[PDB]
Amino acid sequence: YDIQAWKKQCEELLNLIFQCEDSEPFRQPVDLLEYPDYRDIIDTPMDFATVRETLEAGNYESPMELCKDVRLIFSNSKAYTPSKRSRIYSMSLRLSAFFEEHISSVLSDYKSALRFHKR
């Protein structure tokens, strides 16, 4: 019932994501010189270094807020892809399945900890 445990769990999951070859297109903001029309389609850019920095600055209040920003990395890739069979989009799908499989217990444990505290 540790209410704060999600933070280190999320740091460790981000470490696994940064080791994954599938995360390379998403580690830093999308290069606007390489994709000149990117901001014509994407309203809110997001990347894993921004998620890690926000976590490390103490600017997430819960793992749900972190999960919303990671999900935005994946929804931006899906909105920007010219094809659902593109290389970078295909990497985003695999990485999203890996993230979702690992974040489930972090969210469950955090919510259980809040419920125990409320009692």
Ligand X SMILES: Cn1nnc2c1C[C@@H](C(=O)O)CC2
Cα separation, 72 vs 35, in Å, equals 18
Q: Does 25 bind ligand X (CB under 6 A)?
A: yes
Q: Does 90 bind ligand X (CB under 6 A)?
A: no
Cβ at position 47, least distance to ligand X in Å: 10
Q: Does 55 bind ligand X (CB under 6 A)?
A: no
Q: Does 30 bind ligand X (CB under 6 A)?
A: yes
Which residues is the chain interrupted after (C–N above 2.5 Å)? none
Q: Classify residue 19 as exposed, middle or buried by CB count within 10 Å of its CB (0-12, 13-18, 19+).
A: exposed
Cα separation, 28 vs 35, in Å, equals 14
Among 86, 104, 105, 112, binds ligand X (CB under 6 A): 86
Q: In the complex with ligand X, which residue's Cβ is closer, 4 or 83?
A: 83
Cβ at position 36, least distance to ligand X in Å: 11
Q: Does 110 bind ligand X (CB under 6 A)?
A: no
Among 82, 101, 118, 119, binds ligand X (CB under 6 A): 82
Helix pair 63-80, 6-19: axis angle to 10 deg: 30
3-state secondary structure of 83: coil
User: Which residues are near ligand X by CB under 6 A?
Assistant: 25, 30, 35, 77, 80-82, 86, 88-89
